Automatic annotation (TrEMBL):
It comes from the Bacteria. Resistance to antibiotics containing the 2-deoxy-streptamine ring including gentamicin, kanamycin, tobramycin, neomycin and apramycin. Its EC number is 2.3.1.-. It is an enzyme of class 2 (transferase). It catalyses: a 2-deoxystreptamine antibiotic + acetyl-CoA = an N(3)-acetyl-2-deoxystreptamine antibiotic + CoA + H(+). It comes from Escherichia coli. GO terms for biological process: response to antibiotic. This is Aminoglycoside N(3)-acetyltransferase. Zn(2+) binds at C191, H243, C249, C252. Belongs to the antibiotic N-acetyltransferase family. Keywords: Acyltransferase, Antibiotic resistance, Metal-binding, Plasmid, Transferase, Zinc.
Length: 259
């Protein structure tokens, strides 16, 4: 890399429309700016383009969780976990952006933002009555921006809706009446590598639009299409996302013992 094209706002809008983003809808965005860059206006230019594509009637949504099990969450100050990217960390600090008030936070901006983020602490994080399920309920679109289905949180929601038989102990920390309270729960967590199987599943039914957004390979799928397709596979095999024991994956092995 050396003298690469720095996409302007109008071009990014065109790439988003050409990919299938429709005005006035709900759009959940997972992004890796390292794949998107360089843009003319940096990470902020990507957010501005996403919102200009959705128009004033649409709602931009992004993950916003802190990734910290032992610290309480503050929607006004808690940084997002570094694994979510700089765009998610910057998005929630912008004006009029709403954020959920629990460590498994999402952020949203638009006429439907508070229908998406105004739920209390969900257990498990991606259960119903959580932001990722509200996006599914609101029939929104999911856009992966330089990341694969290993970052498609909607697939973890599909795992729960299938009542998948694995669940490992996890915990977070909240502030109740001024004292730090830890909250233990069971999460359907593994290595997430085999989430990539959704590529072939969704493409075989022609449910995944692909194209460039900036410099990144972008995948655009409906939330209902992600859940329905994943449920169809989990209905054939609930352990489809876990590595076989021969693979030696520690985390998937831990999920297998939890059954
Ligand atoms: C906030 N609680 C979290 C807990 O929810 C969990 O979150 C997992 C995360 O650890 C996994 O991370 C796993 O996969 C990563 C790459 N995708 C690499 C690291 C691996 N442990 C994610 N794949 C799925 C999350 N829901 O990670 C442990 C934790 C920090 O206690
Ligand atoms: Zn694994």
């Amino acid at each position: 890399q050396m003298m690469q094209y720095e996409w302007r706002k109008a071009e990014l809008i065109g790439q988003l429309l050409n990919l299938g983003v429709t005005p006035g809808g709900v759009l959940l965005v997972h992004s890796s700016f390292r794949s998107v860059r360089p843009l003319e206006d940096g990470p902020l230019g990507l957010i501005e383009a996403l919102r200009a594509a959705l128009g004033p009637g649409g709602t931009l949504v992004m993950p916003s969780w802190s990734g910290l099990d032992d610290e309480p969450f503050d929607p006004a100050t808690s940084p997002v976990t570094p694994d979510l990217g700089v765009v998610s960390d910057t998005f929630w600090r912008l004006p009029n952006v709403k954020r959920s008030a629990h460590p498994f936070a999402f952020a949203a901006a638009g006429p439907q933002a508070e229908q998406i983020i105004s739920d209390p602490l969900p257990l498990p994080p991606h259960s119903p009555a959580s932001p990722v399920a509200r996006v599914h309920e609101l029939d929104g679109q999911v856009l992966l921006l330089g990341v694969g289905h290993d970052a498609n949180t909607t697939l973890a929601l599909a795992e729960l809706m299938a009542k998948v038989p694995y669940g490992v102990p996890r915990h977070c920390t909240i502030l109740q009446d001024g004292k730090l309270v830890r909250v233990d729960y069971l999460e359907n967590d593994h290595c997430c590598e085999r989430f990539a199987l959704a590529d072939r599943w969704l493409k075989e039914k022609s449910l995944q639009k692909e194209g460039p957004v900036g410099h990144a390979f972008a995948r655009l799928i409906r939330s209902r299409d992600i859940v329905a397709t994943a449920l169809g596979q989990l209905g054939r095999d609930p352990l489809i996302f876990l590595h076989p024991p021969e693979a030696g994956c520690e985390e998937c092995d831990a999920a297998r013992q939890s059954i």
